Amino acid sequence: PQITLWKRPLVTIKIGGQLKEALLDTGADDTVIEEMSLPGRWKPKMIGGIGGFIKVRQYDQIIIEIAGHKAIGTVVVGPTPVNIIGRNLLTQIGATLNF
Amino acid sequence: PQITLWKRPLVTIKIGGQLKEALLDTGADDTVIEEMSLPGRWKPKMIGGIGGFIKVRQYDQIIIEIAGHKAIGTVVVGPTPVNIIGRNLLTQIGATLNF
Ligand SMILES: COc1ccc(S(=O)(=O)N(C[C@H]2CCC(=O)N2)C[C@@H](O)[C@H](Cc2ccccc2)NC(=O)O[C@@H]2C[C@@H]3CCO[C@@H]3C2)cc1
Ligand SMILES: [Cl-]
Ligand SMILES: [Cl-]
Ligand SMILES: [Cl-]
Ligand code: NA
Ligand code: NA
Numbered sequence: 001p002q003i004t005l006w007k008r009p010l011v012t013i014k015i016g017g018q019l020k021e022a023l024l025d026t027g028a029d030d031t032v033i034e035e036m037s038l039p040g041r042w043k044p045k046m047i048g049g050i051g052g053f054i055k056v057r058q059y060d061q062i063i064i065e066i067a068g069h070k071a072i073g074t075v076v077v078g079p080t081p082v083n084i085i086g087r088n089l090l091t092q093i094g095a096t097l098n099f
Numbered sequence: 100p101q102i103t104l105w106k107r108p109l110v111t112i113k114i115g116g117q118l119k120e121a122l123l124d125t126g127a128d129d130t131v132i133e134e135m136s137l138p139g140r141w142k143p144k145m146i147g148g149i150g151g152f153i154k155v156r157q158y159d160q161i162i163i164e165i166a167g168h169k170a171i172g173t174v175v176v177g178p179t180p181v182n183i184i185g186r187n188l189l190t191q192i193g194a195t196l197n198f
Contacts, residue, residue, distance in 0.1 A: 001197070001198065002195050002196075002197050003195055003196040003197070004190065004195055005125060005186040005189045005190045005194060005195070005196075006186075006190050008128070008186070009125050009126075009196060023125075023126050024125055024126070024196055025124070025125060025126025026104060026108055026122075026123060026124055026125045026126065026196070027107075027108075027122045027123075027124030027125070027126050027127055027181075027183060028126055029107070032149065047149060048149075048150065048180060049148045049149025049150040050131070050146065050147070050148035050149065050150060050152075050153060050179060050180070051147060051148055051149065051150030051151030051152050051153055052150030052151055053150060054149060054150050067198075069198065078149075079149075080149055081147065081148065081149075084126055087104040087105075087107070090104045090198075091103070091104050091105055093198050094198045095104060095196055095197065095198040096101050096102060096103050096104065096196070096197050096198070097101070097102040097104070097108055097123055097125075097194060097195070097196060097197075098100070098101050098102070098194065098195050098196075098197050099100060099166075099168065099189075099192050099193050099194040099195070
């Protein structure tokens with residue numbers, strides 16, 4: 001699709017068999033997901049957003065569908081206003097910005 | 100242009116007579132610029148994201164040249180770690196996300 005930006009670019013994602021809403025976020029390096037159960041081991045990461053740094057749990061090689069497009073990659077779990085799909089997965093689904 | 104997302108989508112902007120680097124950010128409702136003076140009236144606001152909230156000054160009817168494209172709208176100014184072009188101005192330059 002071609003997504004205009006008059007409204008927030010919210011899509012449905014599927015992770016762990018569950019559908020969730022997420023924001024397509026070109027200003028995010030990383031994909032940040034609200035607290036949920038994911039398989040496997042995690043490693044620590046600090047991410048710096050608009051209000052400061054926070055600790056998140058980094059899970060690698062997680063299967064995730066984004067607006068019907070398949071991705072497998074890193075997700076970080078921690079406190080976020082909304083699930084955000086960042087560039088690490090936007091590149092997997094072939095997203096570009098165009099003007 | 101078509102901008103891929105392998106790297107942060109940074110562009111040069113001109114605001115208040117000043118050149119700056121800013122992120123084209125589909126996950127940002129508002130355009131957020133680091134501390135600078137702008138003409139006219141303002142009013143305070145809080146904006147929030149990962150790590151919490153910051154206090155900003157909201158200025159309305161500000162013109163910004165974004166990668167050569169002029170756009171007018173509200174700009175908020177405060178202690179952001181990065182300059183952000185949000186959806187309120189991305190729409191005006193006809194930016195879309197495509198995949
Ligand atoms: C009301 O207007 C706004 C409100 C908040 C923001 S935000 O900068 O907090 N943010 C909002 C996103 C995240 C939460 C949400 O609902 N939408 C814009 C983001 O693009 C932000 C933009 C951003 C803010 C501060 C630093 C760098 C980028 N990036 C971000 O938080 O990315 C996180 C932090 C990590 C650094 C970059 O990637 C990592 C993942 C911008 C305008
Ligand atoms: Cl990844
Ligand atoms: Cl506006
Ligand atoms: Cl349009
Ligand atoms: Na867990
Ligand atoms: Na004004």
